[PDB]
Amino acid sequence: DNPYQRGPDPTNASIEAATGPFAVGTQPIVGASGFGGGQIYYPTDTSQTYGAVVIVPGFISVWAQLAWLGPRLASQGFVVIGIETSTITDLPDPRGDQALAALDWATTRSPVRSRIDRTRLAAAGWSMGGGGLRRAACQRPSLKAIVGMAPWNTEKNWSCVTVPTLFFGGSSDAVASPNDHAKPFYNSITRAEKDYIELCNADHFFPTSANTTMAKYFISWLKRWVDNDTRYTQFLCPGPSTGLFAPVCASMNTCPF
């Protein structure tokens, strides 16, 4: 009845799995304009189309530092566009412009354009790449979701955002501290469903290593908004429990949406 739902009915185990139910293919990004290249990941099952998410790096870093996300998310039934920025010191707004340029490359020019539903797109990023999501969402309010991982931006006013927003913060992150970055961003968004999850003891580099707590909620957010898949509302609402000895130290959201 929802034509965009993919994969079997989920469970806590299915969303925590390193590999989802979709076999994954991959290839480098070759010939693209408006960003630095990178790597695409996608289901090999071409019986149907899938939503796509672009993922942008941010701490003076390259795609390799986020690459575990490519198979982790593509295997749940998404095309993942993991990009290099034009330069490793690009500012956040240019990174947002590059996220949109990578989505346009993927849907109009990439070898896998035919298995993307160009109407169902999302953007994500770490650090300054996460900071770029304000530009991406406010320049392209048709996006279905944005997901910021330790997002960094001097611009604290994200009230322009009308796209469902998930932020992950790290309790031990001194570079993009929740108090100065993610939480102000989250508090400023008044026109979109939103979700903030803070990982205990996690430093600015938490997104750069396989992290099941981050992955499960990233997957759930993509499913809910990119695929309209209300089978995944159960993991988002109420969402994680919080505590100093738990993986999650803080949790805020607009459940029930």
Author numbering: 43 to 299
Quote the study on this structure.
In the present study, we report a PET hydrolase from Cryptosporangium aurantiacum (CaPETase) that exhibits remarkable PET degradation activity at ambient temperatures and high thermostability. CaPETase shows an α/β hydrolase fold and a nine-stranded β-sheet at the center surrounded by six α-helices and two 310-helices. Formation of one conserved disulfide bond (DS, C279/C297) and lack of an extended loop in the substrate binding site of CaPETase suggest that the enzyme originated from an ancestor of TfCut2 and LCC rather than IsPETase.
The G196T mutation resulted in positive effects on both thermostability and enzyme activity; thus, we finally generated CaPETaseDS2/DS4/NC1/NC4/HP1/SC2/G196T (CaPETaseM9) by integrating the G196T mutation into CaPETaseM8. CaPETaseM9 exhibited a Tm value of 83.2 °C, which corresponds to a 16.7 °C increase in Tm compared with CaPETaseWT. To provide structural insights into the enhanced PET-degrading capacity of CaPETaseM9, we determined its crystal structure at a resolution of 1.53 Å. The side chain of the mutated V129T was flipped to form a hydrogen bond with the adjacent T131 and D132 residues, thereby further stabilizing the β4–α3 connecting loop. With respect to R198K, the mutated lysine residue moved inward to form hydrogen bonds with the main chains of N195 and D222, thereby stabilizing the wobbly tryptophan-containing loop. Finally, the N109A mutation appeared to strengthen internal hydrophobic interactions.
